[PDB]
Design a protein around this ligand. Structure first.
Ligand SMILES: CCCCCCCCCCCCC/C=C/[C@H](O)[C@@H](CO[C@@H]1O[C@H](CO)[C@@H](O[C@@H]2O[C@H](CO)[C@H](O)[C@H](O[C@]3(C(=O)O)C[C@H](O)[C@@H](NC(C)=O)[C@H]([C@H](O)[C@@H](O)CO)O3)[C@H]2O)[C@H](O)[C@H]1O)NC(=O)CCCCCCCCCCCCCCCCC
Ligand SMILES: CCCCCCCCCCCCCCCCC(=O)OC[C@@H](O)CO
Ligand SMILES: *[C@@H]1O[C@H](CO)[C@@H](O)[C@H](O)[C@H]1NC(C)=O
Ligand SMILES: O=S(=O)([O-])CC[NH2+]C1CCCCC1
Ligand SMILES: [Cl-]
Ligand SMILES: [Cl-]
Lengths: 101, 279
């Protein structure tokens, strides 16, 4: 037997999105299992290269979570997203970061 | 007033040759230790991460971890290369101890197979998980009979070494563990939950400790309609929290987000919804 859990993907900035001021974009990918996952931060569609992320960990139900984060300077023209691929996803899920949030 | 320290290990067995392991140490929710798998060493994430243990003691801990990794992988792979269709599979281990109010230590050692509870170490005996029986019962039998010093070592680690190390860690990192970081709070307009309707959003980011109270209110009446999000992590050990409320436009004036946190020292954070009302 084995349990498969679909990742929860939440995208949020560390500070208010002030177009021009540096900031941090966080993608929190939680509640997934098994551990193999592919997380990418995307600026306007292409993959960001300067992406840090926490060490893998897991909740009390044994599901895993990860925090990917990057410094970024948001602008009006820019759209930022988090793309997660996992065995539970037929195809990668992309969650756009709501600047207006 | 309760504190814990955990060592978590995650093993992915891909085939009868390959298997990758990860490990970390956690004081409550703050990661204090990583594990370098190439050198097989503890990574001290903070200046105080050695927790008043000697370099000899910590290098010996690394020795024991390396031997335990070797033997654990060896025996599991030995059993699994006979069931190769079972590959790939994941094993998770959560060991450690909780210091209870009054200073009472409760150690624990829990193992999951493929994200399902496999077994635990209760008092001084391996206990299989109810459900997931045959493999649990088997492993529990092997652990309770063949593997001698494994059991005693586990008991002494989670019952004596873990709480001593935990209190040494709290003593060494007193300034970081008991820090108070004032949050930043701002307002925004989320997606229209309908025409005329209006989604007020209140963000509270950058706070430690994790406990926080966020609520939309008009005066003292807390709006029962506030939807509070999850407490999400920022990097560098602060937290983020969104609380939303959809109201009727024109009834949004006078609403205000309210944030209480220990770091505030009483003077709570209040942010009134302005919208297009301020020239
Ligand atoms: C620090 C150390 C201290 C901790 C260590 C303690 C834990 C270590 C590990 C604990 C696990 C012990 C419990 C075991 C339970 C079960 O025994 C055993 C399976 O039971 C039966 O076994 C049979 C085999 O025997 C199987 O039948 C085989 O199925 C296969 C399908 O792939 C094929 O059909 C195959 O057919 C052939 C073929 O076609 O050729 C025929 C050949 O005859 C055969 N040749 C043989 C057999 O010699 C060949 C074979 O595969 C290869 O040799 C060829 O390359 O294959 C057929 O045999 C059958 O399904 C199966 O149900 N469970 C497992 O595998 C589970 C995986 C093991 C570990 C998983 C859980 C991790 C351990 C738990 C956590 C670790 C410890 C917890 C705490 C940590 C320390 C405190
Ligand atoms: C294993 C059970 C131990 C439980 C009691 C631990 C006592 C605390 C003292 C430990 C000091 C450092 C803590 C983290 C060690 C590094 C680590 O995360 O290693 C994981 C590795 O093993 C998985 O590859
Ligand atoms: C065993 O697993 C490793 C990890 O991916 C891989 O490099 C190796 O080729 C695998 N063996 C196979 C696929 O036969
Ligand atoms: O100080 S603390 O807020 O307890 C530390 C929180 N660390 C988080 C960042 C990595 C993702 C999950 C845990
Ligand atoms: Cl290994
Ligand atoms: Cl605004």
């Amino acid at each position: 037997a084995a349990i498969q859990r679909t990742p929860k993907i939440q995208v949020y900035s560390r500070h208010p999105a002030e177009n021009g001021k540096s900031n941090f974009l966080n993608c929190y990918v939680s509640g997934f299992h098994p551990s193999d996952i592919e997380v990418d931060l995307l600026k306007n569609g292409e993959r960001i290269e300067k992406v840090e992320h926490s060490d893998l960990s897991f909740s009390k139900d044994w599901s895993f979570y990860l925090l990917y984060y990057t410094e970024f300077t948001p602008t009006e023209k820019d759209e930022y997203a988090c793309r997660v691929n996992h065995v539970t996803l037929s195809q990668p899920k992309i969650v756009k970061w709501d600047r207006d949030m | 007033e309760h504190v814990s320290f955990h060592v978590i290990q995650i093993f992915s067995f891909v085939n009868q040759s390959w298997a990758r392991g990860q490990g970390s140490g956690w004081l409550d929710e703050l990661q204090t230790h990583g594990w370098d798998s190439e050198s097989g060493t503890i990574i001290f994430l903070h200046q105080w991460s050695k927790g008043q243990f000697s370099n000899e003691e910590l290098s010996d801990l690394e020795l024991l971890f390396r031997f335990y990794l070797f033997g654990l992988t060896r025996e599991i792979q030995d059993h699994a290369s006979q069931d190769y269709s079972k590959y790939p599979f994941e094993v998770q281990v959560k060991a450690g101890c909780e210091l209870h109010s009054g200073g009472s230590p409760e150690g624990f050692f829990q193992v999951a197979f493929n994200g399902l509870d496999l077994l635990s170490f209760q008092q001084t005996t391996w206990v299989p998980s109810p459900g997931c029986g045959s493999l649990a019962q088997s492993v529990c039998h092997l652990l309770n009979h063949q593997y001698e010093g494994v059991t005693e070592t586990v008991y002494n680690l989670i019952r004596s070494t873990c709480p001593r190390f935990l209190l040494g860690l709290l003593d060494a990192g007193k300034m970081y563990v008991h820090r108070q970081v004032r949050p930043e709070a701002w307002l925004s307009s989320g997606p229209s939950p309908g025409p005329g309707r209006l989604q007020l959003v209140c963000h509270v980011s950058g706070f430690y400790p994790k406990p926080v109270w966020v609520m939309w209110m008009r005066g003292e009446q807390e709006q029962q309609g506030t939807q509070l999000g999850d407490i999400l992590p920022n990097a560098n050990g602060t937290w983020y929290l969104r609380a939303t409320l959809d109201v009727a436009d024109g009834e949004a004036a006078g609403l205000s987000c309210r944030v209480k946190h220990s770091s505030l020292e009483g003077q709570d954070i209040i942010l009134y919804w302005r919208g297009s009302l301020v020239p």
